[PDB]
């Protein structure tokens, strides 16, 4: 329901090899995953009973020319049932 | 409209503070030291086709 | 909720069939409820200042910029 | 005794001929006892002199109150090519101070012998006496005494026939109150503007001409040759334990017969005022406030002028200072706000304007004090005075900023009801007019 | 230069053969602050500008007139070099000039001149 | 009188006599409608010019 | 009218030459002998005051340049010293400079009731020399505990550096100031 | 961490290198460095108005005051030598409150002429007032003013904006070598000037425009022409002489 609960629940329930960076703050609980685990993570977060995320708000890219993986793709998600928002990010270059 | 003092002196002091805040970049100002040594504009032109009439 | 929306009383209309007619009815009801919220805001609006007092993020008064050095500096830097 | 601290016999006084009844030149000095076996004192070594000064417990008479022996022990013991200097600070410019002038115009040879003794005790090769510029006649008198001392062999090469080579010079300022500060005096004597230096370079390591030097007051120098001759144990038997001796007091203000007098270091202020001088004008009940040690130190109200000891530590514990020990008695017939505003003006006028908090803060304090002199201020302006004084204190290069902030804090601490009362009556007269 | 990203980016081939300068801008002489330092920029050397013969405005025909000053910034020299290498730009690197902290003391203002020498 | 430039118009206003050594120029009778406050030191022989208004102030007596 | 800058005038200007004297050169030698020869700048104040006494109570810009040449420094340093200290008069004061207005401790006993009477008697404002060139009015630096508040300082520049005297007169009545001024006009000096 | 501005510290020997704690971080500096320089090594940039790395130290402005454990009062970091084991504190309330007090004093008699000042967008006074200063001014009385003086055809002078950091005086005395500028007067009435109407004839006299942290000294030919934010900066070399 809240950032304090979702953080712990996804820390415990989620497979560890998917997420590689978890921020818990008031600006937003973020998850950073590899590009080859994005679909699996979102499918898990769309079907699980205690994390019923059924609305994808938007997908945006961020450009960081100083990074090796230049582009950051952000998935803003919304759970209507539990009144919570989750943000999932990945990183990809131009090719 | 550019206003002037009741004495007949223009109020603009060429500070370019309006040119830096203009979100549409509709103002171009050129300034130099006048004969009296006062800070005044030589060119003050506004693009009314770029102006968005925001009042900034 | 954001701003003072949690201090105001208004209903949330909900459809039943999902067709274009329910959308129209809900669009009528939402506008009636907005009228209600406007009335409450008019009645309960308090007195005070209209901006944050942190002048590092908001412009100074036109009388203060022409009378105080720090207010003029803040005005210059902000604009 | 310990229970009763105060009362010096005429024999135990140090500054004889303080009233000018006898000849102040060399003849009177030798008959009174100056320059008496000075060769023996110099021929006992530098270390012995510092030991005697440390035993006597002589604290600085210039206001700071730092122990003299420990200050003299800071001078280098081995010369590395840089000559050592002694500088006597005779540039007294504090308002209501009359001590060093009376010393220099009545006992010049005491000062000269003190300079020689201190130079021997600090391995100094020369001494510069820095006289206030306004003391033209005193400067001429001291110069004549210097000529007499040089002619008699008491100074110069082989001083007193003892092998020590000491030169005494007389420099003088040109009317600046800031020039009395240790480093500002060195700047003035170096031919520059009298602006104080920063402290991390101390005068004992880099002072006059970049050479080690020591700046001392006239009173501390003048009593040095008689502490050694009479004995430190005699000197230490006056006043309390830590701060001991006899110090001059220039009592002025609303007292019946203001005068300058030498008394024990721990004379009670009430006894001091009502014993040598007359009673306070209109009686002790008429008393309103006493400035304990001149302009620099804060103010002390009547309720705590009772049973207060004129000590370096006792007055400090009462959040005041002994300073130059020049009391200024004020009655109920004077506006305290006017006096404090005038002190603020004096400190605004005498600030050298080197550092930002003193250059601007003194002027701001003066303007606010002038505004409150007639109640033309709000009740929240006193808190602004407190904040401004706290901003000035501790951030300045020298102690004139602290001396400029202390009187305002003293006024606020003990006379806040008066400021509020005048503000309120001004507001009432403004409201009842229109 | 393996300017493959330049080919799959969309930059026209005419602008892919530009010569750029990779440099770290230095601190301005009119301010003592050192906040705008440590960032690396790509200078496209876009000097082809003229004057509009109607109002005196500055006209240009160079798309890279202010990109390197406005948006394209890097946190290190290596990042800028990699960017230029991937975009196929002929680059030269200007190493920044950095200050050297020498020993300065307040007591040096007050130094003994020495014994008076009648030389 | 459009032929007179603002420089010539401001060069025809006689300087304002001020008794003190310093004057504060605001630019208008209402402070909020003028320019930022400007304190001008009148310790010279030539009239002192406000850097906003162009108005000149001269010391009255000494 | 104390100003921190100099405007060229017929009375004082850098073009006017200014040497000390034949009699005052021995004083210059004696003054310079008190400090090491590599620190001649330390004798700027005892030379500036000597120039002030010799010239007649004020320091023209030529005197400052002469002192700078004597101590071998840039003239800006001598200007800095002269402007900083309050006993150096850069404007032309009268022959007998009179110092009247008090300070803080001395006004409690009434030291601010003395300037106006003299000012209206001699009829020219403070810092203004009378027509005959004898008297001037200035602000004193009160020197002592000031038991007698109405004190006036009389700086004498009649005979130059040979007859310069700086006296303090204690407890002088607002009419006794007129008495001592009338005595000064004739030539006799009052006692203190 | 790295020194501010990529400054290079030259250690003559590894033996003579004291250790200080700027903000709890161990910093190694040579014997002789000041507290300000030690903070500069530790990536902390102390506010300054009168301190210039090419000029002699003169702790006038009191803006670089920091906290030291064994100190009852804040110390001027520009002039205080660094001692082994010394613990500096910069972000503490004492150093803060000192910085707002000093800024309030500095902006007390400063003229309200930022729009017409050529130092508009490049002034240290207003940049540090925004960062290290307070928000509201408690000063309402009348400010002081001074007249402007002619220093030649290159340096435009508005001394009402002088903050009395004496950097111009120190530059003229030390770097330029032509002693013609100095601080005249005492107190709040002290002024910078040459006293006798003279012009800056030094070939390096134009550098006083840059060392001045405020708009008191500005270029006369480049007067009112443009603001700094409108200008594109190109790093080029010289061709007038062979120094380059
Ligand atoms: C503004 C100011 C003025 C001072 N004036 C004098 C003075 O006139 N005479 C004096 O002995 N000390 C004066 N002092 C204190 C000096 O620091 C003094 O030389 C120092 O305390 C040594 O005094 P001592 O001989 O008692 O040890 C003044 C200090 C300040 C800050
Ligand atoms: S340049 Fe713009 S903001 Fe500045 S005075 Fe002129 S019109 Fe006003
Ligand atoms: S506190 Fe005042 S007198 Fe002392 S150095 Fe600073 S400005 Fe000068
Ligand atoms: S010097 Fe700086 S703060 Fe002062 S007016 Fe100019 S820009 Fe503003
Ligand atoms: S003119 Fe500029 S550099 Fe010179 S003292 Fe004033 S503020 Fe400092
Ligand atoms: S009022 Fe001037 S000496 Fe006392
Ligand atoms: S920079 Fe250190 S006091 Fe000014
Ligand atoms: Zn104006």
Swiss-Prot record, chain A:
It is an enzyme of class 7 (translocase). Its EC number is 7.1.1.2. It comes from the Eukaryota. Its main location: mitochondrion. It catalyses: a ubiquinone + NADH + 5 H(+)(in) = a ubiquinol + NAD(+) + 4 H(+)(out). One of its GO terms (molecular function) is NADH dehydrogenase (ubiquinone) activity. It is found in: Mitochondrion inner membrane. Keywords: Electron transport, Membrane, Mitochondrion, Mitochondrion inner membrane, NAD, Oxidoreductase, Respiratory chain, Translocase, Transport, Ubiquinone. One of its GO terms (cellular component) is mitochondrial inner membrane. It is a peripheral membrane protein. Belongs to the complex I 30 kDa subunit family. Complex I is composed of at least 49 different subunits. This is a component of the iron-sulfur (IP) fragment of the enzyme. Core subunit of the mitochondrial membrane respiratory chain NADH dehydrogenase (Complex I) that is believed to belong to the minimal assembly required for catalysis. Complex I functions in the transfer of electrons from NADH to the respiratory chain. The immediate electron acceptor for the enzyme is believed to be ubiquinone. This is NADH dehydrogenase [ubiquinone] iron-sulfur protein 3. The gene is NAD9.
Swiss-Prot record, chain D:
Disulfide bonds: none annotated. One of its GO terms (molecular function) is FMN binding. Its EC number is 7.1.1.2. FMN binds at residues 172-220. Binds 1 FMN. Binds 1 [4Fe-4S] cluster. It is found in: Mitochondrion inner membrane. NADH binds at residues 60-69. SUPFAM superfamilies: Nqo1 FMN-binding domain-like, Nqo1 middle domain-like, Nqo1C-terminal domain-like. It catalyses: a ubiquinone + NADH + 5 H(+)(in) = a ubiquinol + NAD(+) + 4 H(+)(out). [4Fe-4S] cluster binds at residues 352, 355, 358, 398. InterPro entries: ComplexI_51kDa_subunit, NADH-UbQ_OxRdtase_51kDa_CS, NADH-UbQ_OxRdtase_suF, Nuo51_FMN-bd, Nuo51_FMN-bd_sf, Nuop51_4Fe4S-bd, Nuop51_4Fe4S-bd_sf, SLBB_dom. Keywords: 4Fe-4S, Electron transport, Flavoprotein, FMN, Iron, Iron-sulfur, Membrane, Metal-binding, Mitochondrion, Mitochondrion inner membrane, NAD, Oxidoreductase, Respiratory chain, Transit peptide, Translocase, Transport, Ubiquinone. One of its GO terms (cellular component) is mitochondrial inner membrane. It is a peripheral membrane protein. Its cofactor is FMN; [4Fe-4S] cluster. The keyword Acyltransferase does not apply. Complex I is composed of at least 49 different subunits. This is a component of the flavoprotein-sulfur (FP) fragment of the enzyme. PANTHER family: NADH DEHYDROGENASE [UBIQUINONE] FLAVOPROTEIN 1, MITOCHONDRIAL, NADH-UBIQUINONE OXIDOREDUCTASE FLAVOPROTEIN 1 NDUFV1. Belongs to the complex I 51 kDa subunit family. This is NADH dehydrogenase [ubiquinone] flavoprotein 1, mitochondrial. It comes from Arabidopsis thaliana (Mouse-ear cress).
Curated annotation (Swiss-Prot), chain F:
Its main location: mitochondrion. One of its GO terms (cellular component) is mitochondrion. It comes from the Eukaryota. GO terms for biological process: mitochondrial electron transport, NADH to ubiquinone. Keywords: Electron transport, Membrane, Mitochondrion, Mitochondrion inner membrane, Respiratory chain, Transit peptide, Transport. It is found in: Mitochondrion inner membrane. It is a peripheral membrane protein. Accessory subunit of the mitochondrial membrane respiratory chain NADH dehydrogenase (Complex I), that is believed not to be involved in catalysis. Complex I functions in the transfer of electrons from NADH to the respiratory chain. The immediate electron acceptor for the enzyme is believed to be ubiquinone. Belongs to the complex I NDUFS6 subunit family. Complex I is composed of at least 49 different subunits. This is a component of the iron-sulfur (IP) fragment of the enzyme. This is NADH dehydrogenase [ubiquinone] iron-sulfur protein 6, mitochondrial. The chain holds residues 48 to 109 of 110 of the full protein.
Swiss-Prot record, chain G:
It is an enzyme of class 7 (translocase). It is found in: Mitochondrion inner membrane. Keywords: 2Fe-2S, Electron transport, Iron, Iron-sulfur, Membrane, Metal-binding, Mitochondrion, Mitochondrion inner membrane, NAD, Oxidoreductase, Respiratory chain, Transit peptide, Translocase, Transport, Ubiquinone. [2Fe-2S] cluster binds at residues 101, 106, 142, 146. Its EC number is 7.1.1.2. GO terms for cellular component: cytosol; mitochondrial inner membrane; mitochondrion. Belongs to the complex I 24 kDa subunit family. Complex I is composed of at least 49 different subunits. This is a component of the flavoprotein-sulfur (FP) fragment of the enzyme. This is NADH dehydrogenase [ubiquinone] flavoprotein 2, mitochondrial. It comes from Arabidopsis thaliana (Mouse-ear cress). The chain holds residues 30 to 221 of 255 of the full protein.
């Amino acid at each position: 329901m809240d950032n304090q609960f979702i953080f712990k629940y996804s820390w415990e329930t989620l497979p560890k090899k998917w997420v590689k960076k978890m921020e818990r703050s008031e600006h937003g609980n973020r998850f950073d995953t590899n590009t080859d685990y994005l679909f699996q993570l979102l499918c898990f977060l769309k079907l699980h009973t205690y994390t019923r995320v059924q609305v994808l708000i938007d997908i945006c890219g961020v450009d960081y020319p100083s990074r090796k993986r230049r582009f950051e793709v952000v998935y803003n998600l919304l759970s209507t049932r539990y009144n919570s928002r989750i943000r999932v990010q990945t990183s990809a270059d131009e090719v | 409209a550019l206003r002037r003092y009741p004495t007949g002196e223009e109020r603009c002091i060429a500070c370019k503070l309006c040119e830096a805040v203009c979100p549409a970049q509709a103002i171009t100002i050129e300034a130099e030291e006048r004969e009296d040594g006062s800070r005044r504009t030589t060119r003050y032109d506004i693009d009314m086709t770029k102006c968005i009439y925001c009042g900034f | 909720p954001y701003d003072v929306y949690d201090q105001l009383d208004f209903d949330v209309p909900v459809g039943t069939r999902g067709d274009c007619y329910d959308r129209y009815c809900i669009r009528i009801e939402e506008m009636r409820q907005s009228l209600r919220i406007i009335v409450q805001c008019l009645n309960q609006m308090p007195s005070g200042m209209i901006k944050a007092d942190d002048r590092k993020l908001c412009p100074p008064s036109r009388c203060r910029m022409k009378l105080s050095m720090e207010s003029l500096i803040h005005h210059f830097e902000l604009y | 005794e310990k229970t009763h601290f105060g009362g010096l016999k005429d024999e135990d006084r140090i500054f004889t001929n303080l009233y000018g009844l006898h000849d102040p030149f060399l003849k009177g000095a030798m008959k009174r006892g100056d320059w008496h076996r000075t060769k023996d004192l110099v021929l006992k070594g530098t270390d012995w002199i510092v030991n005697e000064m440390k035993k006597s417990g002589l604290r600085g008479r210039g206001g700071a109150g730092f122990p003299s022996g420990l200050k003299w022990s800071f001078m280098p013991k081995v010369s590395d090519g840089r000559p050592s200097y002694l500088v006597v600070n005779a540039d007294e410019s504090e308002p209501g101070t009359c001590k060093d002038r009376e010393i220099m115009r009545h006992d010049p040879h005491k000062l000269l012998e003190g300079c020689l003794i201190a130079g021997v005790g600090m391995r100094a090769s020369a001494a510069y006496i820095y006289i206030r510029g306004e003391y033209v006649n005193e400067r001429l008198n001291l110069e004549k005494a210097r000529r007499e001392a040089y002619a008699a062999g008491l100074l110069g090469k082989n001083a007193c026939g003892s092998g020590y080579d000491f030169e005494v010079y007389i420099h003088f300022g040109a009317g600046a109150y800031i020039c009395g500060e240790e480093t500002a005096l060195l700047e003035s004597l170096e031919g520059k503007q009298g602006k104080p230096r920063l402290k991390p370079p101390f005068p004992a390591n880099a002072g006059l001409y970049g050479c080690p030097t020591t700046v001392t007051n006239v009173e501390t120098v003048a009593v040095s040759p008689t502490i050694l001759r009479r004995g430190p144990e005699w000197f230490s038997s006056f006043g309390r334990k830590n701060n001991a001796g006899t110090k001059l007091f220039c009592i002025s203000g609303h007292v019946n017969k203001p005068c300058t007098v030498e008394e024990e270091m721990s004379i009670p202020l009430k006894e001091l005022i009502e014993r040598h001088c007359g009673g306070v004008r209109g009686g002790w009940d008429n008393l309103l406030a006493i400035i304990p040690g001149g302009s620099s130190v804060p103010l002390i109200p009547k309720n705590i002028c009772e049973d207060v000891l004129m000590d370096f530590d006792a007055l400090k514990a009462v959040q005041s200072g002994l300073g130059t020990a020049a009391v200024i008695v004020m009655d109920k017939s004077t506006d305290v706000v006017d006096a404090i505003a005038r002190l603020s003006y004096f400190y605004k006028h005498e600030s050298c304007g080197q550092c930002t908090p003193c250059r601007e803060g003194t002027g701001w304090l003066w303007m606010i004090m002038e505004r409150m002199k007639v109640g033309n201020a709000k009740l929240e302006e006193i808190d602004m005075l407190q904040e401004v004084t706290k901003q000035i204190e501790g951030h300045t290069i020298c102690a004139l900023g602290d001396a400029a902030a202390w009187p305002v804090q003293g006024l606020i601490r003990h006379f806040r009801p008066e400021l509020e009362r005048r503000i309120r009556e001004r507001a009432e007269r403004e409201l009842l007019q229109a | 230069k393996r300017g493959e990203i330049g080919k799959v980016s969309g930059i026209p081939e005419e602008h892919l053969s530009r010569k750029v300068i990779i440099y770290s801008p230095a601190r301005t002489a009119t301010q003592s602050g050192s906040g705008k330092l440590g960032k690396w920029k790509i200078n496209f050397v876009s000097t082809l500008k003229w004057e509009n013969p109607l109002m005196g405005w500055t006209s240009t025909g160079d798309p890279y007139a202010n990109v390197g000053d406005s948006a394209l910034a890097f946190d290190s020299e290596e990042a800028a070099k990699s960017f230029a290498e991937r975009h196929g730009w002929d680059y030269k690197v200007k190493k920044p000039n950095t200050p050297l902290l020498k020993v300065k003391s307040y007591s040096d203002n007050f130094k003994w001149k020495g014994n008076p020498q009648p030389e | 009188r459009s032929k007179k430039s603002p420089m010539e118009l401001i060069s025809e206003v006689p300087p304002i006599k001020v008794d003190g050594r310093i004057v504060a120029c605001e630019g208008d009778t209402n402070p909020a409608l003028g320019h930022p406050i400007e304190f001008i030191c009148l310790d010279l022989n030539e009239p002192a010019i406000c850097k906003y208004c162009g108005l000149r102030y001269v010391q009255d007596h000494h | 009218t104390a100003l921190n800058y100099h405007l060229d005038s017929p009375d004082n200007k850098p073009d006017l030459p200014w040497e000390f004297s034949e009699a005052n050169q021995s004083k210059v030698k004696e003054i310079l002998s008190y400090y090491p020869s590599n620190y001649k700048q330390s004798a700027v104040i005892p030379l500036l005051d000597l120039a002030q006494q010799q010239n007649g109570g004020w320091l023209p810009v030529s005197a400052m340049n002469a002192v700078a040449k004597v101590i071998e420094v840039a003239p800006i340093r001598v200007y800095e010293v002269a402007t900083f200290y309050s006993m150096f008069n850069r404007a032309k004061v009268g022959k007998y400079h009179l110092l009247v207005c008090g300070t803080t401790p001395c006004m409690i006993r009434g030291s601010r009731d003395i300037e106006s009477a003299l000012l209206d008697h001699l009829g020219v404002k403070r810092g203004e020399v009378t027509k005959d060139g004898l008297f001037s009015v200035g602000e004193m630096e009160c020197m002592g505990c000031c038991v007698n508040a109405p004190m006036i300082t009389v700086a004498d520049y009649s005979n130059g550096s040979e007859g310069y005297t700086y006296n303090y007169f204690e407890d002088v009545t607002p009419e006794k100031v007129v008495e001592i001024v009338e005595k000064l006009r004739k030539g006799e000096k009052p006692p203190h | 961490r790295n020194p501010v501005g990529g400054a290079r510290v030259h250690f003559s020997n590894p033996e003579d290198a004291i250790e200080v704690f700027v903000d709890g971080y161990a910093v190694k500096v040579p014997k002789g460095f000041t507290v300000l320089q030690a903070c500069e090594v530790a990536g902390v940039d102390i506010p300054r108005f009168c301190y210039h790395s090419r000029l002699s130290i003169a702790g006038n402005c009191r803006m670089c005051l920091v906290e030291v454990e064994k100190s009852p009062k804040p110390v001027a970091s520009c002039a205080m030598p660094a001692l082994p084991g010394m613990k500096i504190k910069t972000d503490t309330p004492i150093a803060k409150k000192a910085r707002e007090g000093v800024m309030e004093f500095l902006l007390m008699n400063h003229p309200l002429d930022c729009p017409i000042c050529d130092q508009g967008g490049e002034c240290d006074l207003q940049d540090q007032s925004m960062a290290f200063g307070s928000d509201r001014g408690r000063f309402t009385e009348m400010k002081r003013s001074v007249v402007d003086k002619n220093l030649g055809p290159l340096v435009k002078t508005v001394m009402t904006r002088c903050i009395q950091c004496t950097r111009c005086v120190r530059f003229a005395s030390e770097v330029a070598g032509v002693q013609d500028l100095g601080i005249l007067g005492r107190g709040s009435g002290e002024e910078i000037g040459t006293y006798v109407e003279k012009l800056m004839t030094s070939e390096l006299s134009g550098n006083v425009i840059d060392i001045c942290p405020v708009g008191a000294l500005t270029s006369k030919p480049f007067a009112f022409k443009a603001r700094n934010w409108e200008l594109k900066a190109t790093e080029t070399i010289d061709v007038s002489d062979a120094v380059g």
